[PDB]
Design brief:
monomer; 6-stranded antiparallel barrel; about 0% helix; 2 domains; 14 strands; mainly beta; 1 helix; 3C-like protease
Amino acid sequence: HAPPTLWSRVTKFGSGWGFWVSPTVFITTTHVVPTGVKEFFGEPLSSIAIHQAGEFTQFRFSKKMRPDLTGMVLEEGCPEGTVCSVLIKRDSGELLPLAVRMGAIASMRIQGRLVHGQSGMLLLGTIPGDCGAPYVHKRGNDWVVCGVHAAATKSGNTVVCAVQA
């Protein structure tokens, strides 16, 4: 069960969502990020280190944007078979945490764009607008983020998050 603090990290952004990994780091899926912008969260691009590959986008800000938060461990995906929760927020305000059995990390071609992804099977579906939602799992009693939601099969039973390489 994700604590409220962790839910508060999921942030509407562009055509989807992003996730505050720490006071300084914000991750999302590349194709939700709006283009031609010069100011993210009021910070000029000159003051943000932005890395973008395989549909995984990371902003490192120059200042503490969410000082309230602790820093979480970001991982390049999760161990195969691990059960993650996708922390979906809907525009309604409704919170839809989806449990997922994670498969293998693999590069994929999804509607053209190259995706450094990890597939997962849902164990209530994802919809257009949910991308950027974080994939998280617990380890001991720390929470870890391992990717951002990026796509799902036509069935909707299989989902893919992008991961950092």
